[PDB]
């Protein structure tokens, strides 16, 4: 599913991401835009052999099992395919674990480089929330 901006903001709010670990909703919407273009089916392979999955591009070395990333840890206890669903629940629940891991949203490279320190409120402007 390719979400609209406000549609995704509302879904993320319902699943408890607004101000989760102090990160306002716009941060999460911004991260999703630049990680996946709001597409739940996005995948991208990395040089280390791992793959990133879903709307928040969650990595198979640490967080989910895809059956082809040797010595990976599956910390979210989910198959990586679950992160591609039109239902974002699995992605959100795993993202909550990642953002609590010590480095906050810096775990998402696109957030660090394109969202951090910007007016992220713009990403939820106009939306009925």
From Swiss-Prot:
<dbReference type="InterPro" id="IPR001916">
    <property type="entry name" value="Glyco_hydro_22"/>
</dbReference>
<feature type="active site">
    <location>
        <position position="52"/>
    </location>
</feature>
<keyword id="KW-0929">Antimicrobial</keyword>
<feature type="binding site">
    <location>
        <position position="101"/>
    </location>
    <ligand>
        <name>substrate</name>
    </ligand>
</feature>
<dbReference type="Pfam" id="PF00062">
    <property type="entry name" value="Lys"/>
</dbReference>
<dbReference type="GO" id="GO:0050829">
    <property type="term" value="P:defense response to Gram-negative bacterium"/>
</dbReference>
<dbReference type="GO" id="GO:0016231">
    <property type="term" value="F:beta-N-acetylglucosaminidase activity"/>
</dbReference>
<protein>
    <recommendedName>
        <fullName>Lysozyme C</fullName>
        <ecNumber>3.2.1.17</ecNumber>
    </recommendedName>
</protein>
<keyword id="KW-0020">Allergen</keyword>
<feature type="disulfide bond">
    <location>
        <begin position="64"/>
        <end position="80"/>
    </location>
</feature>
<comment type="subunit">
    <text>Monomer.</text>
</comment>
<feature type="disulfide bond">
    <location>
        <begin position="30"/>
        <end position="115"/>
    </location>
</feature>
<dbReference type="GO" id="GO:0050830">
    <property type="term" value="P:defense response to Gram-positive bacterium"/>
</dbReference>
<feature type="active site">
    <location>
        <position position="35"/>
    </location>
</feature>
<feature type="disulfide bond">
    <location>
        <begin position="76"/>
        <end position="94"/>
    </location>
</feature>
<dbReference type="InterPro" id="IPR023346">
    <property type="entry name" value="Lysozyme-like_dom_sf"/>
</dbReference>
<dbReference type="InterPro" id="IPR019799">
    <property type="entry name" value="Glyco_hydro_22_CS"/>
</dbReference>
<keyword id="KW-0081">Bacteriolytic enzyme</keyword>
<keyword id="KW-0326">Glycosidase</keyword>
<dbReference type="GO" id="GO:0031640">
    <property type="term" value="P:killing of cells of another organism"/>
</dbReference>
<dbReference type="GO" id="GO:0016998">
    <property type="term" value="P:cell wall macromolecule catabolic process"/>
</dbReference>
<feature type="domain" description="C-type lysozyme">
    <location>
        <begin position="1"/>
        <end position="129"/>
    </location>
</feature>
<keyword id="KW-0378">Hydrolase</keyword>
<keyword id="KW-1015">Disulfide bond</keyword>
<dbReference type="GO" id="GO:0005783">
    <property type="term" value="C:endoplasmic reticulum"/>
</dbReference>
<dbReference type="GO" id="GO:0042742">
    <property type="term" value="P:defense response to bacterium"/>
</dbReference>
<dbReference type="GO" id="GO:0005737">
    <property type="term" value="C:cytoplasm"/>
</dbReference>
<comment type="function">
    <text>Lysozymes have primarily a bacteriolytic function; those in tissues and body fluids are associated with the monocyte-macrophage system and enhance the activity of immunoagents. Has bacteriolytic activity against M.luteus.</text>
</comment>
<dbReference type="GO" id="GO:0003796">
    <property type="term" value="F:lysozyme activity"/>
</dbReference>
<keyword id="KW-0732">Signal</keyword>
<dbReference type="GO" id="GO:0042802">
    <property type="term" value="F:identical protein binding"/>
</dbReference>
<dbReference type="GO" id="GO:0005615">
    <property type="term" value="C:extracellular space"/>
</dbReference>
<keyword id="KW-0964">Secreted</keyword>
<feature type="disulfide bond">
    <location>
        <begin position="6"/>
        <end position="127"/>
    </location>
</feature>
<dbReference type="InterPro" id="IPR000974">
    <property type="entry name" value="Glyco_hydro_22_lys"/>
</dbReference>
<comment type="similarity">
    <text>Belongs to the glycosyl hydrolase 22 family.</text>
</comment>
